[PDB]
């Protein structure tokens, strides 16, 4: 339908004095298209782009902002520079809505240098603390890549986790744990306490139940001793739910040739 080479020259035209928000938006779309189907990439081309993209920033226009994020987001493992961005970044951060902020972290995370990190940590603290989960959620994912990169220092942060540990959004409830597990999973022990930690606890954005299941079993699995008092507690609960899947989840695992307790399983089953 359409072709890259011409476009590659032409994109900079938005960068040419040209005012017509639409035009450029479209052109950007195409680039992304070229890209989406599959595209070579490289530096020179990038660098030239680096000056090109950069001037264009008296835009207020929110949507305009969106577009940017995406593009930048494109550059990550093959990323080029950050300092410019800092100011920019800062701008999202101070930036009123919430929104702006999430995209930026998101590009950042495969790509970056230890160093700055410290600074940006503070920002993290803030994200960590904010009530509109979303951004906070946005924050989290980045970290993972940062874990890719590393994430250990991220570890240091466990504390924040705790302050966070109080949660009330379901999905969100879910997200926290995922991290956590990773964290403690390098560690049996705590977890044992964790269990306890949840033990007082039920779960908000369920999903949480489920990872935990795999988990809850996963210690037990090796013979994290007592199925009996703990496991079972879990099970009645598990059993009970209309989170039929959860019930299942337990059910599926317990595949026991003699029937560990053959009986009950059959009800669950009937139900199945």
């Amino acid at each position: 339908h359409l072709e890259k080479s011409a476009v590659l020259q032409e994109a900079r035209v938005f960068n040419e004095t040209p005012i017509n928000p639409r035009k450029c938006a479209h052109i950007l779309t195409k680039i992304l298209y070229l890209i989406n189907q599959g595209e070579h990439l490289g530096t020179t081309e990038a660098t030239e782009a680096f000056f090109a993209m950069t001037k264009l920033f008296q835009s207020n226009d929110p949507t305009l902002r969106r577009m940017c994020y995406l593009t930048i987001k494109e550059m990550s493992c093959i990323a080029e520079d950050v300092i410019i961005v800092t100011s920019s970044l800062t701008k999202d951060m101070t930036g009123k809505e919430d929104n702006y902020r999430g995209p930026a972290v998101r590009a950042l995370c495969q790509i970056t240098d230890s160093t700055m990190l410290q600074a940006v940590e503070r920002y993290m603290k803030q994200a960590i603390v904010d009530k509109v989960p979303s951004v906070s959620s946005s924050a989290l994912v980045s970290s993972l890549h940062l874990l890719k990169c590393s994430f250990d220092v991220v570890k240091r942060w466990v504390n924040e986790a705790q302050e966070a540990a109080s949660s009330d959004n379901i999905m969100v409830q879910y997200h926290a744990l995922g991290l956590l597990y990773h964290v403690r999973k390098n560690d049996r022990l705590a977890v044992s306490k964790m269990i306890s930690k949840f033990t007082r606890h039920g779960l908000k954005s369920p999903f949480a139940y489920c990872m935990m299941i795999r988990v809850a079993s996963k210690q037990l699995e090796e013979e994290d001793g007592s199925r009996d008092s703990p496991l079972f507690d879990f099970i009645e609960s598990c059993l009970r739910n209309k989170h039929e899947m959860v019930v299942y989840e337990a059910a599926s695992a317990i595949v026991n040739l003699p029937g560990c307790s053959a009986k009950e399983l059959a009800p669950a089953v009937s139900v199945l």
Binding site: T94, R156, W157, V158, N159, S166, D187, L189
Partner: protein, 604 residues
């Protein structure tokens, strides 16, 4: 999380609406201004009046101590400034600065200044070295100047609060603020600063019951807080702990954690409204004026949690409220007794639970640490959680292999390796529990002795103490009991027989167990077993060891402190503050021993 914490009703007075309070640090004196019109200065410590002054008899709004200056500053709403040299209370000077109701003074400490805000919609600066010049006048008002606070951090820059709801922060080169921001939706009663230099917050007060946090460097309202029960007369930064003090127009205390931001607690001294507050900069004691009176409370621990391996690493955790993330210290070098030393750097940890106990395993090794009321024990080198649970009270089985617990009921269960030890299971009235070699249950203003395998009331002695330290091998044991102190022998054989015979006294315990050797009437800052030697601190700050019928002071210490640790090999004592400079004084254990043995007739 719990109030297993220091709250002390430090000092009380019931009085009037004590509007203002101002602190004398340099000697912990406090100045208070009343709605009576009389102002008084007290030494709280013994509830004693340092001086009182009738400055005016009109309510006296503002007060300062000028410590550097050695004089005390006062103003009443005769619109005059009266000066005393506090070095009597001899009154130096008077003059009329601000001609309207003078609300607040903020002072530059570094630089010789007194800043004032007054209701005249004026802020004037006056220079004391110039002998109360009105050096400069700061204006940019819209109403009475209700409050001035100096950002003392940058003394130099300061912030102003008015109830027309706005805040001007100023630069000297702005006898006007640099800017005004439109804070309140009420009025900005108050402006306050964030203790740390590192980051920057203000809290400002309103009775609207909404709190906004601001970061100056960005220049944002960081966030805005809600939850409240009644018009917050005041809310304050805890400078010691990260907590938020909230205060009300009814004198309600609510605390939100300045980290949890969860209501940690509400307290009622319904002494009505928060008129003033002033805080210890040492961040621990604070006073507020209320109507029915005022109350001052004392809120601190005296230590971090650390325990030292005799290689020479006192591993502590935290610093004061810093993460636990910081333990280590094997050092590497040597220097003179008086002179000071260097540390290593490699944190481990970054716990969450906030402790107040550290205790080593008996081989240093396993520490059990309690905090938030539960016990994390660490595998230390491991940095592993050795284990956890919730406490109430504790004894390691001294041996280094079991432990006991007092459940937040009060009835004993003990665990050795997570096995309850029921061979021993009195559960009598207690007070506290003591482990060691020989079991103490402190009960019924008595201290009662128990076996280690079955309980036995071995003995009961007269009263209760506070603390026990046992000699090392247990043998002669040292119990700290206020002023007074005792040293004892425990004699085994009797028991063995007696036990065999069975028929005994145990109300008293059995009078055929222990003997009372001698007692020193003693006050202990910190204290030590060197073996069975009691090497001790006194809180009178002499470090003495009771030796030979003698108590000798090896040395006397600044003021008294904490016993770093004497790594015997080195024969030295490492002395420890709480501010992480270690001093060492060598002894030589042998000398003591030499003495010990010879008296024993081990002359050779």
């Amino acid at each position: 999380m719990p109030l297993r914490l220091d709250i002390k009703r430090k000092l009380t007075a019931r009085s009037d609406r004590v509007k203002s309070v101002d602190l004398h640090p340099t000697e912990p004196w406090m100045l208070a201004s009343l709605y009576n019109g009389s102002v008084c200065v007290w030494n709280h410590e013994t509830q004693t009046l340092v001086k009182t002054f009738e400055v005016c008899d009109l309510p006296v709004r503002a007060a300062k101590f000028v410590a550097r200056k050695n004089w005390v500053v006062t103003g009443a709403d005769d619109m005059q400034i009266r000066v005393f040299n506090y070095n009597t209370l001899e009154r130096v000077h008077m003059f009329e600065a601000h001609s309207d109701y003078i609300r607040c003074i903020a002072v530059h400490p570094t630089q010789p200044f007194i800043l004032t805000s007054s209701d005249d919609m004026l802020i004037k600066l006056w220079d004391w070295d110039k002998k109360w010049s009105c050096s400069q006048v700061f204006e940019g008002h819209t109403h009475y100047v209700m409050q001035i606070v100096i950002n003392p951090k940058d003394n130099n820059q300061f912030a102003s609060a008015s109830l027309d709801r706005t805040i001007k922060v100023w630069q000297l080169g702005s006898s006007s603020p640099n800017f005004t921001l439109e804070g309140h939706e009420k009025g900005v009663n108050c402006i306050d600063y964030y203790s740390g230099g590192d980051k920057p917050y203000l809290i400002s007060g309103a009775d609207d019951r909404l709190v906004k946090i601001w970061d100056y460097q960005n220049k944002t309202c960081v966030q805005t807080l809600e939850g409240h029960a009644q018009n917050v007369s005041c809310a304050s930064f805890h400078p010691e702990l990260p907590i938020i003090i909230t205060g009300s127009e009814d004198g309600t205390v609510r605390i939100w954690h300045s980290s949890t931001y969860r209501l940690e607690s509400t307290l009622n001294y319904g002494m009505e409204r928060v008129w003033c507050v002033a805080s210890l900069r040492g961040s621990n004691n604070v006073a507020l004026g209320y109507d029915e009176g005022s109350i001052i409370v004392k809120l601190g621990r005296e230590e971090p949690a650390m325990s030292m391996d005799a290689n020479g690493k006192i591993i502590w955790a935290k610093h004061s409220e810093v993460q636990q993330a910081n333990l280590k210290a094997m050092g590497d070098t040597e220097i003179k007794d008086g002179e000071r030393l260097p540390l290593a750097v490699k944190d481990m940890g970054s716990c969450e639970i906030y402790p107040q106990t550290i205790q080593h395993n008996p081989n240093g090794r396993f520490v059990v640490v309690c905090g938030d009321g539960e016990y994390i024990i660490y595998t230390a080198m491991a940095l592993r959680n050795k284990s956890f649970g919730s406490a109430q009270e504790f004894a390691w089985a001294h041996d280094s292999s079991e432990y006991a617990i007092r459940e937040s009921n009060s009835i004993v269960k003990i665990f050795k390796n997570f096995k309850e030890k029921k061979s021993f299971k009195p559960d009598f009235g207690a007070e506290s529990i003591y482990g060691g070699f020989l079991l103490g249950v402190r009960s019924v203003n008595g201290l009662a002795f128990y076996d280690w395998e079955n309980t036995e009331l071995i003995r009961r002695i007269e009263i209760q103490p506070k603390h026990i330290f046992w000699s090392d091998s247990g043998e002669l044991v040292c119990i700290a009991t206020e002023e007074s102190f005792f040293i004892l022998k425990y004699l085994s054989e009797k028991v063995l027989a007696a036990q065999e015979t069975h028929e005994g006294v145990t109300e008293d315990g059995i009078e055929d167990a222990f003997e009372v050797l001698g007692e020193i009437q003693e006050i202990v800052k910190t204290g030590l077993w060197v073996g069975d030697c009691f090497i001790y601190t006194s809180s009178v700050n002499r470090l003495n060891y009771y030796v030979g019928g003698e108590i000798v002071t090896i040395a006397h210490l600044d003021r008294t402190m904490y016993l770093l640790g004497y790594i015997p090999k080195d024969n030295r004592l490492y002395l420890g503050d709480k501010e992480l400079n270690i001093v060492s004084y060598s002894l030589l254990v042998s000398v003591l021993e030499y003495q010990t043995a010879v008296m024993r007739r081990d002359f050779s």
